[PDB]
Write a protein that binds this ligand. Sequence first.
Ligand SMILES: [Cl-]
Ligand SMILES: [Cl-]
Ligand SMILES: [Cl-]
Ligand SMILES: [Cl-]
Ligand SMILES: [Cl-]
Lengths: 294, 284, 298
Amino acid sequence: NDALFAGEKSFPVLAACEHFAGSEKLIGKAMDLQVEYGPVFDVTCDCEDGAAAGQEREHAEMVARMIASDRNVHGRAGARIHDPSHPAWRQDVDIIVNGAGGRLAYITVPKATNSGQVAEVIRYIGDVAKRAGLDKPVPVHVLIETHGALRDVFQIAELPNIEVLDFGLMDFVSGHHGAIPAAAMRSPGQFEHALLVRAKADMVAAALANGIVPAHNVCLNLKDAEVIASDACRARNEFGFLRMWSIYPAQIQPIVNAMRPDFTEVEDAAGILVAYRYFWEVLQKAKVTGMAVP
Amino acid sequence: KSFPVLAACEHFAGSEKLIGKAMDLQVEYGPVFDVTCDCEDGAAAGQEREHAEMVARMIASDRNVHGRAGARIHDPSHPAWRQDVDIIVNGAGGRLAYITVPKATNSGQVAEVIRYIGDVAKRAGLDKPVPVHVLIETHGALRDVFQIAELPNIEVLDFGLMDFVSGHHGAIPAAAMRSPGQFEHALLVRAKADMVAAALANGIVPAHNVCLNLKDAEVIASDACRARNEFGFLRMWSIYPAQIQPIVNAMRPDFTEVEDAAGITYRYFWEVLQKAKVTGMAVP
Amino acid sequence: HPNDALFAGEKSFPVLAACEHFAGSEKLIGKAMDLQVEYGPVFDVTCDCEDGAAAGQEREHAEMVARMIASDRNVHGRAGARIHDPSHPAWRQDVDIIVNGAGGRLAYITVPKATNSGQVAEVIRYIGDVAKRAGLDKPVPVHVLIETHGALRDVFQIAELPNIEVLDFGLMDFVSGHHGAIPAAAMRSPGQFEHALLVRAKADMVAAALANGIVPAHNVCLNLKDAEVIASDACRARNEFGFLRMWSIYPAQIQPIVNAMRPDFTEVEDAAGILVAATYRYFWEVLQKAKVTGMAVP
Ligand SMILES: [Cl-]
Ligand SMILES: [Cl-]
Ligand SMILES: [Cl-]
Ligand SMILES: [Cl-]
Ligand SMILES: [Cl-]
């Protein structure tokens, strides 16, 4: 099915959910939850929020060790590095790429203010990956959470090895000199404010135009499954997001289930393929979201 | 530059039988709608020259009374698109109203097809260039919509909802391919509004995709009204004859508006009077 | 030690009045300047040349505008002028007369109907030349109308041009360029906040303005005296689109626009507290917004 439709770039088949963990304890717990739930979600080892004042070297070292370890069973653990303006972002790249033991799933690049910063970070990851003897390039996840990154979203989406564009609602709103009220940083405002609709739709349009998965910001409700599912459904059905971040384990199953294809849709997709392109995407989405494939 | 005064409706017909019937319906109704002879959906699997040769003959024939018959050729990646242009431009007897270009994935493909149409039209001894209708129905064509709208001889930008949605790796649900979703989904609002903004910025008519309801006049009228009054579309495609009159009437200027337009800023009122004529209304 | 000198790695966001009142005659300019004395500089005054000036009275009208702006009547120095568009034969003459005449009190120049980035850049460069020759130390701030297809297409390029402090949304002229595709009903509320082309245009301009530390300003309310309707338009522009200013064409529109644009009383109380103990750039913007909108600063 893959060898029969390939004149074009293959769309990445990625988990509907990306769970964040900053500490060794929470990274381990998340990796263990992947064993429990199946790789229905990816784990991002956070450096940007996780690393302390002057503990950047120690923290990236722990992250690299955690990703390289036997604890990382499914190899679906990536890392969020510091932003391109932070002096430790290169050091994070170097420590994690050289130390990850080739198990590094991706690198998440936050707070870039333009296409140039992203290109520089991807170029650097590539140089470090080459220098480490890595065969395949390290996939990159790029945050779109600044004015410049949104303005340059179509240029960013054309950069090499990007598999995800992440919408950063909080940092995006903070840059608007108080023109976007706080109420718009919560639902339903985040799907209705003209600037946020514009930003989300531009990001998704740029991502999908370039075979990139568009990923949605977290739900601020940590434990109410119905509220988490509602945000994931609005993001999936009204904007075209195919992935969503998680900051609390209770958020994973509602995100995965909201992003899942219909049971009858996958049944039909397998039958048609028993013999297209669309139905193959549906069957691949069903496997990645932990559903039974016929 | 004068804005193009085009019929509010564009009816599609793939077979000789349906092309003929559509041309006869233009005689019945008046040229309130254009006819697009469809080589893209209409042509058989490997009978592209035979079909193009039928289309050219139908457009050149006496049966085409109002000279408001264009053709939709194959997409720029299809091996028969140049052959469709060769056969239809050289064979149309100079009656060819326009060429509809579908599924272009970038500005380059559109420019190439326009350039080729121009070359064939010049060699065929055509005085005026063949007007072009460009489908915006891919990621690349939407990304490049402002660049496409600046290309020469384009008089229409057509929104291709179905092919546009199909390229979204299932991110746009099936419910959005129909009303009210096709006018409310953030990606579809964005795509439609970008296309209309690009078209109107360059004196091009923005045209809307078909209504999937073939015979219910109220549902067809509703789609044509939303596309006209919420998005700025000035034309809409038809795939069934029963869709023509609801589309034309939904796009018509207000009776009092035309009465005031005749009693004559002036470029606007002139556009209204010309719209009233093209839409088969009584001009005072 | 001051809040302004403590944050300078970036450009400071302009602290402008929530309202901009237009007046085209000497009488109405006078009255608007007097109303700034009565209300406080909670609103700016734009001396309209563009609409104000008669058939061949462009020089005479710009001379009156310059005289009014330079006069003792202009107490708060919050009086700008709208010159003619870049295609108009009097725009340079308006700049010459008003800049050389304003006695250094000119608050800004409003540039209308530009059809591209190049026209805007040309007008700004010309204002700069005249400002420097008139002995002005600081450049004359510019307000640019986004009311054409070309200016909307080039909005991000326009927003990068020097000395722009406001991007104005010109609904009426923007709609008139759409060959009747935007109906008249969309030129009023709720259509002007809901028509796909208008949402797109307004959101693009606000996004371009805010991306470049420029204040996005909203078009007038066509209801001249109903405070509830004026407040409603100011609130939709403020809370759904991110506009931080709005035009006024009738004095009764000023207070509803200012009040709709005001920060919450508790928000300013907190902003003063955080800043005294001293994110801070946000709370500083809120405290400055409170002063410019005539609220009591703690
Ligand atoms: Cl750009
Ligand atoms: Cl299942
Ligand atoms: Cl369609
Ligand atoms: Cl005078
Ligand atoms: Cl206006």
